[PDB]
Subunit: 386 residues, 4 copies
């Protein structure tokens, strides 16, 4: 009954089930988890792997000796469980030194420190087998207009990512980068605030083939945008390297609810798209078990992430396989949308009187699209009413 | 006292001062304006030029004979006034045939009609001297998830813009295209919903140098985004071909208030950016005089657009010229943001112990950014308190 | 299979299935419906009744002779079908004279006209058997700060509703009033923008027992608010006289999607609440079939409204009846929320050392709320996974 | 030059300038302030007084002996400076025991503890001379639908406030209560989310005259609402007991920017309203100096709060005193809005043929409202262009 196995490629950040519940108005409600116990308990739930910030695994300020011991314990738990580490990232947001950013801090010495901190963790990520390295520029931005010249900041952001690309290629590493956009919080406005801005920025890097996006459900919804649409544009560009799954109830603070919570129909259309398009990367959950919960509630919430994905996968597959839906898709001319507008070419289009001079605009306008019948079939399938 | 002249390059759409006031819940409150009278009255206010949709100038369904007469009258009013036509666009949204889009309608014959309607107006735009041709895909999108396969739709959108680029190059025309993004309304979600998504899409076209963006103040604010930040990214990419100026009070329906209304401090930072960066294109107002107004209120609202730009231009110039502000910018290290992070190169950065091993993180973290004093100087200048 | 009957009390506005599809950017895509054909076709779908604005039934400007004929035809269709008319309302928004409002227009003669237009339709509503008279003040508000002194406007709004209450009581009519809130559109901001503001205003009227609210799903969601929470507060106050059901995708223009579209989980919790609380008024749909649709799509969309209510009603009933859910509700202490905090009284609470001096705060804080397990049971029931 | 004095009644929370900068993603960037030093430094800036949560002044868990010493030190600093304490409040949100609320926690023993913690601080507030006691129910709400039966929760909320009212009246205290609404954060949805919901709730309390609202600029703007409109409704009801001034950039997390930042024109219309209506309570700033700042930036930000109020007060006064504005207000019929619609009474209105039968609707509809000219005069005054 909707039981995950490692073959489903579900992954979790250490910082997700490990969130202690400290929010802007309250103290932690849960004790800290040992990364080793998180790995074991996620493996028992059927997860495929875990992800980490450098500072989740190795406490900030650790000596190289303490560092080696933290990694060894972690690697033993991976060996004991069969868990993988497909992605890693850098914490460039918690320490006060990053209060005006890492790669785009106004202070030059902070920007250089941010790069060295990142490079050190790229080496570790490669050692643990990660294929994707995520960057979330949570402190890159501003609360006021004069604090940040955004053209200069984008120069500094391009400089940093170009240097990281030079580093991985000079080392011969087989790892790619994914930018994770967010429109705001903790900064008043964050640079590269949506999937679109991130995709555009990547095309100005020196080696664009090394960079893609890591979109998050809740972040695009914090701008009121359609998350499945943004994912479709990322897939269209060949840039969906990784994805963060969770839930969000509209335009407000970043809730990071378990996947399936928040906008349920958007979750359905997202799963439909990922499965139809053959996305084969990790299904990663960047979520926070609410601070109302004890540890039993933490693992229930994590299990719910995977359960809801598998239910939605079944409903989307039934929808697409239903002969009545296939008929309705043709009634709404989805087949015609997939056919070229003018494969006959520009001159033939210009000479085609049926395209303008003799086109019956009123008869075309009278044709209903039949979208509402199609959408109610989708609703019936989602709710198990068919 | 803040009087515009044609040298300020202020332009207006025919559809702006000509809006009759018909909204989703009410009938028109003003009679239709003759395009000739709009041109004369805008010239008297100090405007530089006007812009048009094909259907604003030539009523839909006109014979080629009626078409020639409408253009001749219009050209005589331009000659009489000295007004220019720097931009033109196509109406692919009003007629019922476009109810599921123009370039991305599911019906193939509608997509072909949309292209022919566009090409006809490009010829006219070139004849009238327009340098920019805008595309606003207001009907390209969906209210429901199954109605539109977005990857197929982006294929169709790329096909349409590639064909338009082939047409202008084969004709030898000196005109460029600008995509105008909007996140929603009238469709539930619109394709290419922000500046960022539009910039990313342009990089996949066959001749990207022919295409830029025409961002609108209110549209980015309908997604809660920072409009000056988005303009900075457009300028950074070299793609700000045109701009639509107006006002918007937050995340709601597209208000198209006069420029300076809505988010006043965003208007200040926008003018600061455009003038600092040396933007030399038209200052175009895409606004609607509220339907509460009679025709005297229409011209007062239009005059207010230009007045507010000129006041903000004066305040932003005083801000940047103030020695106390220049000192505050250095106190906040804006000078350091403009300096390369690592012009010494990757290897030197890796060997630089002052960047990591010996970096004093606590001393750097203790340095205040002094952003609040800088922002209050900006407030004082905006309000004329200094 | 989820077939409605008149006993389910589903009702529709004439203006809903009759919407011709004219939006701010496009012309109508459907011909006008005769109110008589709408009544017949809704009765065949299983509706219980219809509602109307005065101007939906009687074209504006009709002579008393034409008026009598329009009513007679309508009443014959009601007799032929068994359809009821449980609610009626006034159009105080379409005609240009109402461009600055009806009850709160700055012009005094317009306010007097608005009252007389309303009173005439109250008489007709009573004649047709309506029990609720709705007021939606769509033009009451402002686009700018100086246009409307809101204290004076609330005086005028109270004056108008007090006069309507004096009229119905002096005539001996058995009808009550319901205010329908909306935060914005078509005005930049609308007075009494949410359920809460409307409830507060009612308490200042001379006969508060005559007035309640008619909340609409999409309108509270245009302010990002939780619609089931607002309905609970309306029920708590005894003021839920009527309700408008539809769908909305977040904070944007008023979409009026069919019920069940938009925020599906909010629709589930709404139906759970209405059925648990024993709401016995009409289940009214204030929705617009998208303008992509022809008339077959109109009736499919209307049928979908009722279908989705009945599916959600079944799932919510299964949820509440599940012994495992009843156990989970006790695990989350919903039973304790329903018990008085201090029925022993103030002095006993002050003397109770177990409430403060000897209260074990750390042991209470450690108790998990078990909300995530409860919410996944609710998800499983909604999706038919249990 | 815009220098505050204690007569301006500017007040600050201890938690405002004392905010250490810990946000959901980062550690504190500033050391804790001693309440005594905050009082001294605010007095030097020209503040009138300070406000406090119990836990700001007395560390949680203090013995009665430590408690007495903390109060004595504080009172000496008040005596040394002349600073007043006009308002106090309870922290029912930081400690983990309040993770599901205080007054509406599902656990009954937590609700009783919350009341006793509140009552203890009411005694202290009265001893320090506070006239208003604020309640912000930041933890009262839910992330999921089944966690909280909102009707039961409102019963518990009414029970708690009724008991507090019984306590103050039985003690003979001269203090009143003010509810501070917020729509969300830290809970997914918070009960009584806007000014309107709070005003409505107060009318169901046993002694409504003891309770009013404490609205906050940023909180109403987190729902996209018009803050001056909401304040006008609060003043109209006689319930504006206190106010929280700050800034917010649209619908996102609660920014608590300094007053004047965020929506500048809303700040102008707010000051215009408060000064016109003769509001005589404290001008309280509930703001957070951004965590980018050091302590010099903290005091600059606090000074900016008061400076911006005084600049806006001067501009609003000049606006209202301008003969040209007074003429424009009459041109827009603001004088007519203040006159009764029908002081002649219902029967005279019904018999008045000029109100309907002989009303010239087309001539009334043709009258422009002249709102745009009025609003540009307001803009000119705000910017010092007149
Ligand atoms: Mg997130
Ligand atoms: Mg993430
Ligand atoms: Mg617009
Ligand atoms: Mg535009
Ligand atoms: Mg609606
Ligand atoms: Mg409605
Ligand atoms: Mg706040
Ligand atoms: Mg506050």
């Amino acid at each position: 009954n909707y039981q995950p196995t490692p073959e489903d490629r579900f992954t979790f950040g250490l910082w997700t089930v490990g969130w202690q519940g400290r929010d802007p108005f309250g103290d932690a409600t849960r004790r800290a988890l040992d990364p080793v116990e998180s790995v074991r308990r996620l493996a028992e739930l059927g997860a495929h792997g875990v992800t980490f910030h450098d500072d989740d695994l190795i406490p900030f300020g650790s000596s190289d000796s303490e560092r080696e011991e933290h990694v060894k314990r972690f690697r033993q738990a991976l060996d004991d469980t069969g868990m993988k580490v497909p992605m890693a990232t850098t914490n460039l947001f918690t320490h006060p030194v990053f209060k005006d950013g890492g790669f785009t801090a106004n202070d030059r010495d902070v920007r250089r420190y941010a790069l060295r901190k990142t490079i050190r963790n790229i080496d570790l990520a490669v050692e643990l087998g990660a294929e994707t390295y995520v960057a979330w520029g949570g402190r890159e931005g501003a609360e006021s207009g004069g604090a940040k010249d955004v053209r200069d900041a984008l120069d500094r952001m391009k400089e940093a990512f170009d240097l990281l690309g030079e580093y991985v290629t000079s080392q011969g590493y087989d790892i790619r980068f994914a930018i994770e956009p967010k429109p705001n919080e903790p900064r008043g406005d964050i640079l590269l605030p949506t999937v679109g801005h991130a995709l555009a920025f990547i095309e100005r890097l020196e080696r664009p083939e090394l960079y893609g996006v890591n979109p998050e459900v809740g972040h695009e919804q914090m701008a009121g945008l359609n998350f499945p649409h943004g994912i479709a544009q990322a897939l269209w560009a060949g840039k969906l390297f990784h994805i963060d799954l969770n839930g969000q109830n509209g335009i407000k603070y970043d809730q990071d609810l378990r996947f399936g919570a928040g906008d349920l129909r958007a979750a359905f259309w997202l799963v439909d798209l990922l499965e139809s398009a053959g996305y084969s990367g990790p299904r990663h959950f960047d979520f926070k078990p609410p601070r109302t919960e004890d540890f039993d509630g933490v693992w229930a919430s994590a299990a719910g992430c995977m359960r809801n994905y598998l239910i939605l996968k079944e409903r989307a597959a039934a929808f697409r396989a239903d002969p009545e839906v296939q008929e309705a898709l043709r009634a709404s001319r989805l087949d015609e949308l997939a056919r070229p507008t003018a494969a006959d070419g520009l001159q033939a289009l210009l000479d085609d009187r049926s395209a303008f001079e003799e086109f019956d605009v009123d008869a075309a306008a009278a044709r209903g699209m039949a979208f509402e019948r199609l959408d109610q079939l989708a609703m019936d399938h989602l709710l198990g009413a068919r």
